[PDB]
Amino acid sequence: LKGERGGYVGQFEQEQRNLPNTGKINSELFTHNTIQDDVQRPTSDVGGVYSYEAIIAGQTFVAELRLPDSLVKQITSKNKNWQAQLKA
RNA sequence: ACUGAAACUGUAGUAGAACCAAUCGGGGUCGUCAAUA
């Protein structure tokens, strides 16, 4: 055998009878340059080219904000529709 | 127990060189056609 080393597994109940669904995150490499302004082309003095891997568009992620009841009281006493402010 | 910032995938480079839209041809000239009685 070899160990599993990454990716994300979905939900799994004590009698799932199936392997859990596996989510994969699509990522792409983007490549950029810096232009040395007097020669108007990349040069070693400006570092030339650099790359970023990025999580591409269209991916959907779930976070959770956890708050104690005392803060949720505090918020709700000031805005009853406060979870609507979390749309951004 | 707190998102790094900032950075043009740009710079130089003639889709071009060679290649016949061409070769041959008198604006010419004679007997055919029909089948019977």
PDB file of N, CA and C in Angstrom, chain A residues 31-71:
ATOM      1  N   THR A  31       1.734  33.170 -15.589  1.00  0.00           N
ATOM      2  CA  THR A  31       3.095  33.657 -15.739  1.00  0.00           C
ATOM      3  C   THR A  31       3.069  35.109 -16.179  1.00  0.00           C
ATOM      4  N   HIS A  32       3.960  35.893 -15.584  1.00  0.00           N
ATOM      5  CA  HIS A  32       3.967  37.335 -15.692  1.00  0.00           C
ATOM      6  C   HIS A  32       5.392  37.766 -15.977  1.00  0.00           C
ATOM      7  N   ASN A  33       5.578  39.012 -16.381  1.00  0.00           N
ATOM      8  CA  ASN A  33       6.921  39.561 -16.471  1.00  0.00           C
ATOM      9  C   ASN A  33       6.976  40.944 -15.847  1.00  0.00           C
ATOM     10  N   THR A  34       8.192  41.432 -15.655  1.00  0.00           N
ATOM     11  CA  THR A  34       8.429  42.830 -15.349  1.00  0.00           C
ATOM     12  C   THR A  34       9.266  43.428 -16.460  1.00  0.00           C
ATOM     13  N   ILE A  35       8.883  44.617 -16.886  1.00  0.00           N
ATOM     14  CA  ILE A  35       9.525  45.324 -17.979  1.00  0.00           C
ATOM     15  C   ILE A  35      10.485  46.342 -17.392  1.00  0.00           C
ATOM     16  N   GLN A  36      11.736  46.304 -17.831  1.00  0.00           N
ATOM     17  CA  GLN A  36      12.674  47.380 -17.548  1.00  0.00           C
ATOM     18  C   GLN A  36      12.381  48.557 -18.459  1.00  0.00           C
ATOM     19  N   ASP A  37      12.129  49.723 -17.878  1.00  0.00           N
ATOM     20  CA  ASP A  37      11.349  50.726 -18.582  1.00  0.00           C
ATOM     21  C   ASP A  37      12.140  51.422 -19.675  1.00  0.00           C
ATOM     22  N   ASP A  38      13.464  51.472 -19.565  1.00  0.00           N
ATOM     23  CA  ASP A  38      14.257  52.127 -20.597  1.00  0.00           C
ATOM     24  C   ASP A  38      14.489  51.247 -21.823  1.00  0.00           C
ATOM     25  N   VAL A  39      14.706  49.942 -21.643  1.00  0.00           N
ATOM     26  CA  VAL A  39      14.757  49.032 -22.784  1.00  0.00           C
ATOM     27  C   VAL A  39      13.389  48.520 -23.190  1.00  0.00           C
ATOM     28  N   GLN A  40      12.371  48.729 -22.368  1.00  0.00           N
ATOM     29  CA  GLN A  40      10.997  48.321 -22.641  1.00  0.00           C
ATOM     30  C   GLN A  40      10.844  46.823 -22.885  1.00  0.00           C
ATOM     31  N   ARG A  41      11.662  46.004 -22.236  1.00  0.00           N
ATOM     32  CA  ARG A  41      11.583  44.553 -22.321  1.00  0.00           C
ATOM     33  C   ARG A  41      12.066  44.032 -20.986  1.00  0.00           C
ATOM     34  N   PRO A  42      11.641  42.840 -20.570  1.00  0.00           N
ATOM     35  CA  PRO A  42      12.197  42.264 -19.347  1.00  0.00           C
ATOM     36  C   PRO A  42      13.706  42.132 -19.413  1.00  0.00           C
ATOM     37  N   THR A  43      14.331  42.243 -18.247  1.00  0.00           N
ATOM     38  CA  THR A  43      15.769  42.108 -18.089  1.00  0.00           C
ATOM     39  C   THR A  43      16.044  41.482 -16.736  1.00  0.00           C
ATOM     40  N   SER A  44      17.275  41.012 -16.570  1.00  0.00           N
ATOM     41  CA  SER A  44      17.687  40.455 -15.290  1.00  0.00           C
ATOM     42  C   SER A  44      17.625  41.485 -14.170  1.00  0.00           C
ATOM     43  N   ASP A  45      17.895  42.759 -14.473  1.00  0.00           N
ATOM     44  CA  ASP A  45      17.820  43.797 -13.450  1.00  0.00           C
ATOM     45  C   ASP A  45      16.428  43.923 -12.841  1.00  0.00           C
ATOM     46  N   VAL A  46      15.378  43.554 -13.578  1.00  0.00           N
ATOM     47  CA  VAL A  46      14.018  43.664 -13.063  1.00  0.00           C
ATOM     48  C   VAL A  46      13.441  42.315 -12.669  1.00  0.00           C
ATOM     49  N   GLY A  47      14.229  41.248 -12.750  1.00  0.00           N
ATOM     50  CA  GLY A  47      13.781  39.926 -12.389  1.00  0.00           C
ATOM     51  C   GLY A  47      13.089  39.142 -13.480  1.00  0.00           C
ATOM     52  N   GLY A  48      12.827  39.743 -14.634  1.00  0.00           N
ATOM     53  CA  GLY A  48      12.277  38.989 -15.739  1.00  0.00           C
ATOM     54  C   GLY A  48      10.866  38.488 -15.551  1.00  0.00           C
ATOM     55  N   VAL A  49      10.707  37.211 -15.230  1.00  0.00           N
ATOM     56  CA  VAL A  49       9.393  36.590 -15.175  1.00  0.00           C
ATOM     57  C   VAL A  49       9.203  35.916 -13.831  1.00  0.00           C
ATOM     58  N   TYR A  50       7.946  35.843 -13.421  1.00  0.00           N
ATOM     59  CA  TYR A  50       7.524  35.211 -12.190  1.00  0.00           C
ATOM     60  C   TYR A  50       6.195  34.527 -12.452  1.00  0.00           C
ATOM     61  N   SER A  51       5.883  33.527 -11.633  1.00  0.00           N
ATOM     62  CA  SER A  51       4.661  32.755 -11.785  1.00  0.00           C
ATOM     63  C   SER A  51       3.901  32.673 -10.475  1.00  0.00           C
ATOM     64  N   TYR A  52       2.580  32.622 -10.587  1.00  0.00           N
ATOM     65  CA  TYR A  52       1.679  32.260  -9.502  1.00  0.00           C
ATOM     66  C   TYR A  52       0.857  31.051  -9.909  1.00  0.00           C
ATOM     67  N   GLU A  53       0.833  30.021  -9.070  1.00  0.00           N
ATOM     68  CA  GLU A  53      -0.305  29.114  -9.084  1.00  0.00           C
ATOM     69  C   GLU A  53      -1.506  29.810  -8.474  1.00  0.00           C
ATOM     70  N   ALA A  54      -2.680  29.573  -9.039  1.00  0.00           N
ATOM     71  CA  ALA A  54      -3.890  30.111  -8.454  1.00  0.00           C
ATOM     72  C   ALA A  54      -5.005  29.085  -8.512  1.00  0.00           C
ATOM     73  N   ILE A  55      -5.837  29.086  -7.474  1.00  0.00           N
ATOM     74  CA  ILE A  55      -7.142  28.446  -7.534  1.00  0.00           C
ATOM     75  C   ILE A  55      -7.977  29.159  -8.579  1.00  0.00           C
ATOM     76  N   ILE A  56      -8.381  28.442  -9.620  1.00  0.00           N
ATOM     77  CA  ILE A  56      -9.095  29.074 -10.722  1.00  0.00           C
ATOM     78  C   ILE A  56     -10.504  29.479 -10.312  1.00  0.00           C
ATOM     79  N   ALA A  57     -11.149  30.294 -11.143  1.00  0.00           N
ATOM     80  CA  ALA A  57     -12.515  30.741 -10.919  1.00  0.00           C
ATOM     81  C   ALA A  57     -13.512  29.587 -10.977  1.00  0.00           C
ATOM     82  N   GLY A  58     -14.672  29.805 -10.359  1.00  0.00           N
ATOM     83  CA  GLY A  58     -15.744  28.837 -10.357  1.00  0.00           C
ATOM     84  C   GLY A  58     -15.670  27.795  -9.267  1.00  0.00           C
ATOM     85  N   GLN A  59     -14.590  27.764  -8.505  1.00  0.00           N
ATOM     86  CA  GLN A  59     -14.464  26.857  -7.379  1.00  0.00           C
ATOM     87  C   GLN A  59     -15.346  27.338  -6.236  1.00  0.00           C
ATOM     88  N   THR A  60     -15.914  26.405  -5.481  1.00  0.00           N
ATOM     89  CA  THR A  60     -16.790  26.744  -4.369  1.00  0.00           C
ATOM     90  C   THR A  60     -16.259  26.123  -3.089  1.00  0.00           C
ATOM     91  N   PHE A  61     -16.125  26.942  -2.051  1.00  0.00           N
ATOM     92  CA  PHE A  61     -15.529  26.555  -0.782  1.00  0.00           C
ATOM     93  C   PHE A  61     -16.508  26.871   0.331  1.00  0.00           C
ATOM     94  N   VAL A  62     -16.443  26.108   1.411  1.00  0.00           N
ATOM     95  CA  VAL A  62     -17.248  26.373   2.593  1.00  0.00           C
ATOM     96  C   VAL A  62     -16.332  26.636   3.774  1.00  0.00           C
ATOM     97  N   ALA A  63     -16.462  27.812   4.366  1.00  0.00           N
ATOM     98  CA  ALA A  63     -15.946  28.111   5.690  1.00  0.00           C
ATOM     99  C   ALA A  63     -17.094  28.140   6.683  1.00  0.00           C
ATOM    100  N   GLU A  64     -16.752  28.190   7.960  1.00  0.00           N
ATOM    101  CA  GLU A  64     -17.736  28.418   9.005  1.00  0.00           C
ATOM    102  C   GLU A  64     -17.212  29.473   9.956  1.00  0.00           C
ATOM    103  N   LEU A  65     -18.022  30.485  10.217  1.00  0.00           N
ATOM    104  CA  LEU A  65     -17.772  31.414  11.305  1.00  0.00           C
ATOM    105  C   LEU A  65     -18.489  30.876  12.534  1.00  0.00           C
ATOM    106  N   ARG A  66     -17.747  30.644  13.607  1.00  0.00           N
ATOM    107  CA  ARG A  66     -18.316  30.220  14.877  1.00  0.00           C
ATOM    108  C   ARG A  66     -18.242  31.367  15.868  1.00  0.00           C
ATOM    109  N   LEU A  67     -19.358  31.644  16.539  1.00  0.00           N
ATOM    110  CA  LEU A  67     -19.437  32.700  17.525  1.00  0.00           C
ATOM    111  C   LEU A  67     -20.198  32.189  18.736  1.00  0.00           C
ATOM    112  N   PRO A  68     -19.821  32.612  19.934  1.00  0.00           N
ATOM    113  CA  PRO A  68     -20.604  32.262  21.114  1.00  0.00           C
ATOM    114  C   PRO A  68     -21.940  32.983  21.125  1.00  0.00           C
ATOM    115  N   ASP A  69     -22.867  32.416  21.894  1.00  0.00           N
ATOM    116  CA  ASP A  69     -24.209  32.975  22.002  1.00  0.00           C
ATOM    117  C   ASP A  69     -24.195  34.422  22.485  1.00  0.00           C
ATOM    118  N   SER A  70     -23.269  34.768  23.379  1.00  0.00           N
ATOM    119  CA  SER A  70     -23.207  36.135  23.886  1.00  0.00           C
ATOM    120  C   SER A  70     -22.903  37.153  22.794  1.00  0.00           C
ATOM    121  N   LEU A  71     -22.031  36.812  21.847  1.00  0.00           N
ATOM    122  CA  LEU A  71     -21.787  37.723  20.733  1.00  0.00           C
ATOM    123  C   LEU A  71     -22.943  37.732  19.745  1.00  0.00           C
TER     124      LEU A  71
END
